Design a protein around this nucleic acid. Structure first.
Lengths: 110, 98, 82, 94, 781, 88, 98, 92, 110
DNA sequence: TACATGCACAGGATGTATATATCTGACACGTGCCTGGAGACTAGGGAGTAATCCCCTTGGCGGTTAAAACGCGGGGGACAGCGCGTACGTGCGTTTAAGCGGTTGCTAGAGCTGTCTACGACCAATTGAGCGGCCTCGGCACCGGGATTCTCCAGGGCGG
DNA sequence: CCGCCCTGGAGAATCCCGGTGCCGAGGCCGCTCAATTGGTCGTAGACAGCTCTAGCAACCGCTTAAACGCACGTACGCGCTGTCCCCCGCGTTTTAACCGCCAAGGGGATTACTCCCTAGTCTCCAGGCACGTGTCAGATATATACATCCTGTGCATGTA
């Protein structure tokens, strides 16, 4: 009896692979030893950040009447949020474009 | 004869290209420029198409951010026209020039 | 023999890039300066990518070498692997 | 040749947060690049943290300190929450 | 020599010289009689026009033609001060000083004269500081010392004798060239002292060369004739004999007499004996604190007038003037410069500042006053003074042993570097016979090198001083802060504070603060005011919250009421000046005339407060001190009771605190009340202080200046006392063989208050406080 | 009311006007407007919070309450500001 | 008399402080400011002296570099007086405000 | 026992300037510089080994990291120095 | 019968320690294996860079009439050489100061 | 004839240069030691090399059509000049706090030594989760014809 | 009677709704490799104890140079105006990007075999870190000799 081989992601209540993160930490030349809770914590953090971008990108897809996330929606979600813009400040998203922003000096005077 | 005032067409293209997504430089001139720059380092170099596309995305992102800082420099100098000295000041403050 | 391909980055392309950057008025001396800074930027990225290619004992330049070269310069690019 | 990616996990997280929204190949590639980049940053910060404190192991404390160092502000303090109970839930099972 | 490695990189050569010249900026750069000090003003400009128009206030242009001002000019001598007027000046430099003088003195004096809300106390304080300023400025006219003479040629004035004159309270950078005729005419005694100093018969070059061949010293039963002064007392002559006998053996010493016995007179007379009798008239150095140094200067002027004592303080210009006008007999030479002075008085600060200019002098004698400052061997002063090339040294102090035996080891290693060693401390938990033998060995080793005489052995009129330890229980607020600090409760310590910045570094500091008063903590008065006085804070519950916030304050209030009922004046010493702020506010709302001295008070206001407290017509009752301030020179004759609110780690600091009022000449029995919090960290403060008094009584007090068999018993008894814990009609100002007398004033007298919220501020005080609050609303203000 | 708060609040005003003037003189500034000093104090405060927060994080990882110089070095490096002369 | 022109004393101070290398901020107010900032993040913090020395060196280096960029902004706007808008422009181009 | 680079920096200084000293702060700065360049080159070589699926760091990875990090003439002169040092170490 | 031990620095003609560099490469978590010539190459490169900065700083000390290199001389040497300036662009040297320069518009007149 | 006064000359005291002896700071060097680096040997896996697949990238015609190049008019913006007033520099006098030295006890923290245990590396058998291949059909891109929204210029009306 | 402002209408640009279709998003299936589980074991780090040094809180004293307040002058920032020129908008013509297709060939990616380089281990030894000293160079003290200036006395003259 091998107790049906329950995965570590289902034990941690996660959707990100704890075992793959553990293997990438062991084979990534980061330390000689890797603790047991470190891949769990890292997979939970990665899944939280993925959900945080994906919810804002889904909102951005809904505001432009789309049911499919394109890179433009990802760029709008990242640049419109204050803290994801600091996390990805030196990051280019391909086919993302820019935020629509015109300086008020260049606007016509009425 | 019909005429627009100088500037409203420019605002129309600013609204057009800040909404668009595609690359603003043509593919073959950029590919030829990449190959000419690359043959100075190593002769007989081949290129994946995705390599040239990634170079194009990086180059246009660099130039668009440079033009945003150039526009900020021009607005700071009480101007609406960008000058080469605005590019020089933006690259100097950004640390790329000195 | 490839020569004078920096003029292939035409004046309307530079105007379109400035329009995406939010620029309303462009002086006539902008385009040569933009061509020069594009050439310097492309020389840096292409030199690092060719170094990455030559380390791998390869003749073709992959997109992944370009991603590595842009990573090394603090200019991370998403959407081409990595 | 088998090539691994975070595509199915990003897809099921997307189905959690938006069950009626799809995604494209380019957006999935960008999401994979984002997850790989953030994993590299956090693992490198935890490796440096273990090196500075003369420790041979990376535990959840080093990853927690790396998350607090790298993630800006409130995005850190929720993530520090989201990791911690997960570890606790793992402690409840394994 | 030649480099073996070079660079193959083809870089351009770079001038790395970052030195700049501003010569090109000289186009915008270059291409002494003015107003210096305004002293006094007179209400009549030229003549008395009349007594009319004495109302209103004058303007600046009105004062420009109505007053004449006393002016000390730039580069002058305070004798050419002129009574001038704005129209009589014209436009010279320093007119802004005259404008500032006219502005703040004239307008502030006229508004404090013409205001209706001015009491008599403020106007007499302003009058006494006004005349103090005038007496300080009038002191500058008198010369103090003539430095050098010259023959100067004026504008067709042939040759004129010009004296270099130093003034009384001025320094050597105010030393000025003056005519000889008026200087002789106004003060000829200083001129005669100058010619006596010129062809003097005592020089460092005429010194004897005693090298381990010093003559035997006979005991002097009479005052020597070269010490003119006043009259030396018997114990001072005995001290003179002791210092001369120690010098004849080639040994150094500590003059450990208590304060008030005149140690300055003894060492000045010993310097006079060393100069006149043994012909050792070379360069002597005396290093003193700056506060006591005028008391050394007049002692040298009185007791040894024939000596060339010089004063070494001031800025760089004044010390340079001393260096190149008064050190050398031949200052313009270049070889060996012989010294001109006899004694050099200096301070610690200019020892550290000028150790290069003063360490290269072959000193014949050294006297360090207040040598407890030298108690640390790792200090910069110890390293500076120990590196001096001095034949004979001497330490003058009152407390040679303060905290541990290492300080006494440092003192005797400064005196005799090597013949004495101390490597074992004193532990009270052992109490073995080996420690007693070590203590007796230290007794017999430093017995002839320390001369200590006590204020109780001489001058048989001194009233006794009784110390009473009063231990009071903590209040509920003090108990809950003590529990929150001791069992650290950052969330509970924050509570209602918006900032919440509570620092729990230095736990014992916070425990001492909690033992003193809860109001030392931030946002602590608001909780007491809103919890019991329901937040109205209407002038009467504030005093009540002050009194029942701390358990020491109820005892202090009862003591102050009982001492105000009697004819007593009280000092209170505290270790923290924030506690002094709390007591000053307590006596301000309480309405008691108090004076205060701490480190924030400058020396002029310190002397004003000391003179106001010691005046016979003083309305002051209570005088507050920070314990470690003021030095040893504060004279507090008129006070009778001393209350140690906060005990010190060093018991000698509390001893000088008690000795501020227990000086020679006190006419009343000094009573000392020590305020102690029960079951707190102050108890081990007193335990450590009691152990230090046991240590000081062992070595120093039993080796001053058939009982040897009882010494082996009474040292064991005092070690058994030091090995035991002291913590297991109260406030009477009265008290109705030496070994049992030391068992006194270590007893603990517990005080129980049991006073609730509705007893204090009685019907006499509550009617006075309510009428004052009601009358304040009628007059607004 | 001689008693008051123990803590001090305007410690940002300890960065005085002549200190900011000296720092601008090292930067080659000839003329300084009067509104510069408050902006400079705010910029210094933002930079100091950014460095000090990371240094305190490095201190708390080592289970310490003393901020060492090496923690300050590690923090500045991670902000892209490498500092020499304190790393050894 | 002999009043200097407005600007030459500033040039002398520039030439003096660009030669010297000592810290231009007094040590005790900087220690008080570092402790005030640090007690918000964590209470009961002790500081090594070299930590405050390194913080001071980094702070003056950052401020001097920002003042050079601010002076470049002021010169670009045809001015010789630095203004807060030059500081915001320098920090915006540097990416601190962006 | 502090594990510094001070003596080797001193020998290099005596090679290039035999009569010039160095202060303690300048020596600490040079120690920090050598540590910084060490960790930059070793990190770039570790990344180069990981990118090419290689388990070892050889002189090729160090050479590529040197020409990736060092600019211009510094890069090619350092490649020349390292190449002749490896050649001298191999032959003997 | 072991032979006479000689250092690996003397084999490569270097002054920098090859063995210490090899030990720091092996314990620095960079790769699973370290080649033989890699510490030799890295020690040679580190020694060359040290030689360049020390030569330029000795020139800076000689030009200012000093016999000891201070941090000011190191700062002047690094900032006056453009390759060493851009190698250490994001590097602050303590007690080093700045390069003395004034902009031309701030000069008074001709 | 004797007393008082102006003028010139020779020998004595003093400042400064120089040879010799002594004190103080630094530098190579003797010694210990100890720990990290070097020599020697073994094994196995990482890397090199070869054969094969196969897919992708590098050099010429054909259409088409949208983008680029070019010319021209004009008007808006860059720039120069001038005036004004105000904010900043500068000097001076006065206060104040930084800097330094110093107390006094306690605690944090580095460093060294020694024990011990939980925890992670490692290995074998197993199995199930994830990935490549295939197929489909709906979300999204393209196109066409109104509807609407939008600056821009000329004309009428109203106030000065 | 004249200048300005509102507005009416004109046509260009863009939105919107409907239709068509197309091709990647996503679901299903086989398989096979990597995660899981179970067991063993070495050691990393936690813990405990002892020693020494920096930091901390709140206070003291002294010095002195920096900070600050104020007044005054003036340089410079900013606003306004004119002018001219250069960039923008638009029409017309060219041209080359883009899509598609051609033809071969070579570079890069799986599978098998080999070999040599490096980790690991043990033993030895010397490089480097501290002390602590003989010796060398710079500064200073000390005795001695030569250039330079203050000074006392004899010779001559005037006067009573």
């Amino acid at each position: 009896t091998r107790a049906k081989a329950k995965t570590r992601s289902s034990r941690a209540g996660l959707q990100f692979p704890v075992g793959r993160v553990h293997r990438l930490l062991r084979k990534g030349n980061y330390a000689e030893r890797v603790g047991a809770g470190a891949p769990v914590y890292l997979a939970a953090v990665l899944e939280y950040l993925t959900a945080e971008i994906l919810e804002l990108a889904g909102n951005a897809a809904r505001d432009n009447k789309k049911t499919r996330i394109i890179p433009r929606h990802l760029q709008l979600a990242v640049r419109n949020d204050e803290e994801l813009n600091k996390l990805l400040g030196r990051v280019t998203i391909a086919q993302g474009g820019v935020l629509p922003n015109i300086q008020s000096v260049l606007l016509p005077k009425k | 004869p019909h005429r627009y005032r100088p500037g409203t067409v420019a605002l129309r293209e600013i609204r057009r290209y800040q909404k668009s997504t595609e690359l603003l430089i043509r593919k073959l001139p950029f590919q030829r420029l990449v190959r000419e720059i690359a043959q100075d380092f190593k002769t007989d170099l081949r290129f994946q198409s995705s390599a040239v596309m990634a170079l194009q995305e990086a180059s246009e992102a660099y130039l668009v951010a440079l033009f945003e800082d150039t526009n900020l420099c021009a607005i700071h100098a009480k101007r609406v026209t960008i000058m080469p000295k605005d590019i020089q000041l933006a690259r100097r403050i950004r640390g790329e020039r000195a | 023999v490839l020569r004078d391909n920096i003029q292939g980055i035409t004046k309307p392309a530079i105007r379109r890039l400035a329009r995406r950057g939010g620029v309303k008025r462009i002086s006539g001396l902008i385009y040569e300066e933009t061509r020069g800074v594009l050439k310097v930027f492309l020389e840096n990225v292409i030199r690092d990518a060719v170094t990455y290619t030559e380390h791998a004992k390869r003749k073709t330049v992959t997109a992944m070498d370009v991603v590595y070269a842009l990573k090394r310069q603090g200019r991370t690019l998403y959407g081409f692997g990595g | 040749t088998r090539k691994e990616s975070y595509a199915i996990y990003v897809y099921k997280v997307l189905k959690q947060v938006h069950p009626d929204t799809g995604i494209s190949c380019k957006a999935m590639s960008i999401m994979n690049s984002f997850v790989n980049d953030v994993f590299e940053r956090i693992a490198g910060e935890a490796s440096r943290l273990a090196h500075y404190n003369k420790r041979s192991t990376i535990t959840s404390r080093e990853i927690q300190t790396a998350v607090r160092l790298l993630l800006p502000g409130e995005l850190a303090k929720h993530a520090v929450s989201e990791g911690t109970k997960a570890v606790t839930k793992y402690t409840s099972a394994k | 020599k030649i480099p073996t490695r070079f660079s193959n990189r083809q870089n351009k050569t770079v001038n790395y010289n970052i030195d700049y010249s501003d010569d090109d900026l000289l186009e915008s750069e270059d291409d002494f009689h003015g107003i210096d000090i305004v002293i006094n003003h007179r209400l009549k400009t030229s003549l008395e026009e009349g007594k009319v128009l004495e109302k209103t206030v004058p303007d600046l242009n009105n004062c420009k033609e109505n007053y004449e001002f006393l002016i000390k000019w730039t580069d002058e001598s305070h004798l050419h001060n002129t009574w001038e007027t704005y129209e009589s000046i014209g436009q010279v430099r320093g007119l802004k000083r005259l404008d500032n003088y006219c502005k703040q003195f004239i307008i502030e004096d006229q508004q404090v004269r013409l205001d209706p809300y001015v009491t008599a106390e403020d106007i007499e304080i302003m009058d006494m500081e006004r005349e103090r300023r005038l007496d300080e400025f009038e002191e500058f006219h008198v010369p103090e010392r003539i430095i050098d003479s010259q023959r100067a040629s004026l504008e067709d004035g042939t040759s004129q004798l010009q004296y270099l004159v130093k003034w009384r309270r001025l320094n050597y950078d105010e030393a000025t060239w003056e005519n000889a005729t008026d200087i002789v005419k106004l003060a000829p005694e200083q001129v005669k002292h100058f010619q006596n100093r010129e062809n003097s018969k005592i020089l460092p070059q005429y010194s004897s060369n005693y090298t381990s061949q010093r003559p035997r010293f006979e005991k002097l039963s009479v005052q020597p004739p070269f010490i003119k002064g006043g009259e030396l007392r018997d114990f001072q002559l005995t001290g003179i004999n002791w210092m001369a006998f120690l010098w004849s053996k080639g040994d150094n010493g500590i003059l450990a007499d208590e304060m008030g016995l005149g140690k300055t007179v003894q060492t000045v007379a010993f310097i006079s004996w060393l100069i006149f009798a043994r012909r050792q008239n070379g360069p002597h150095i005396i290093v003193v604190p700056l506060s006591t140094m005028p008391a050394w200067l007049d002692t040298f002027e009185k007791w040894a007038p024939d000596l060339n004592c010089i004063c070494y303080m001031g800025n760089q210009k004044s010390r340079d003037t001393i260096r190149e006008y008064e050190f050398y007999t031949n200052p313009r030479a270049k070889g060996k410069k012989t010294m001109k002075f006899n004694v050099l008085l200096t301070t610690y600060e200019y020892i550290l500042k000028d150790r290069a200019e003063l360490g290269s002098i072959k000193w014949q004698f050294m006297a360090v006053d207040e040598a407890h400052r030298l108690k640390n061997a790792e200090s910069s002063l110890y390293e500076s003074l120990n590196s001096f090339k001095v034949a004979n040294r001497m330490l003058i102090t009152g407390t040679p042993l303060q905290n541990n035996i290492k300080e006494l080891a440092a003192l005797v290693n400064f005196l005799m570097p090597g013949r004495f060693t101390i490597d074992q401390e004193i532990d009270f938990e052992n109490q073995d016979e080996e420690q007693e033998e070590y203590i007796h060995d230290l007794h017999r080793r430093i017995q002839p090198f320390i001369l200590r005489r006590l204020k109780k052995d001489v001058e048989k009129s001194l009233p006794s001083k009784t110390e009473r330890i009063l231990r009071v229980e903590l209040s509920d607020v003090q108990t809950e802060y003590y529990k929150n600090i001791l069992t650290k409760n950052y969330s509970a310590l924050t509570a209602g504070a918006k900032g919440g910045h509570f620092s729990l570094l230095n736990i014992m500091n916070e425990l001492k603060k909690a033992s003193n008063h809860p109001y030392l903590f931030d946002n602590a008065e608001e909780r007491v005011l809103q919890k019991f006085g329901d937040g109205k804070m209407t002038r009467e519950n504030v005093l009540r919250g002050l009194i029942m916030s701390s358990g020491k304050m109820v005892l202090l209030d009862q003591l102050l009421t009982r001492l105000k009922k009697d004819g007593h004046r009280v000092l209170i010493f505290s270790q923290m000046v924030r506690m002094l702020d709390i007591l000053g506010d307590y006596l301000s709302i309480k309405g008691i005339n108090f004076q205060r001295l701490d480190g924030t008070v400058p020396s002029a206001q310190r002397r004003i407060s000391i003179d106001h407290f010691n005046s016979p017509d003083s309305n002051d009752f209570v005088f507050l001190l920070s314990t470690r301030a003021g030095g040893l020179g504060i004279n507090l004759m008129t006070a009778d009771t001393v209350v140690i609110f906060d005990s010190d780690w060093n018991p000698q600091a509390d001893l000088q605190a008690m000795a501020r009022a227990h000086r020679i000449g006190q006419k009343n029995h000094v009573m000392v009340y020590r305020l102690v919090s029960k079951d707190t960290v102050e108890e081990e403060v007193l335990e450590r202080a009691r152990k230090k008094m046991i240590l000081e009584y062992a070595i120093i007090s039993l080796g001053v200046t058939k009982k040897n068999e009882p010494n082996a018993g009474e040292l064991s008894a005092i070690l058994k006392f030091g090995a035991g814990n002291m913590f297991t009609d109260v406030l009477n100002h009265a008290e109705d063989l030496g070994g049992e007398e030391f068992l006194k004033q270590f007893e603990v007298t517990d005080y129980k208050a049991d006073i609730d919220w509705d007893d204090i501020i009685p019907e006499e005080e509550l009617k006075k406080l309510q009428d004052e609050e009601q009358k304040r609303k009628d007059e607004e203000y």
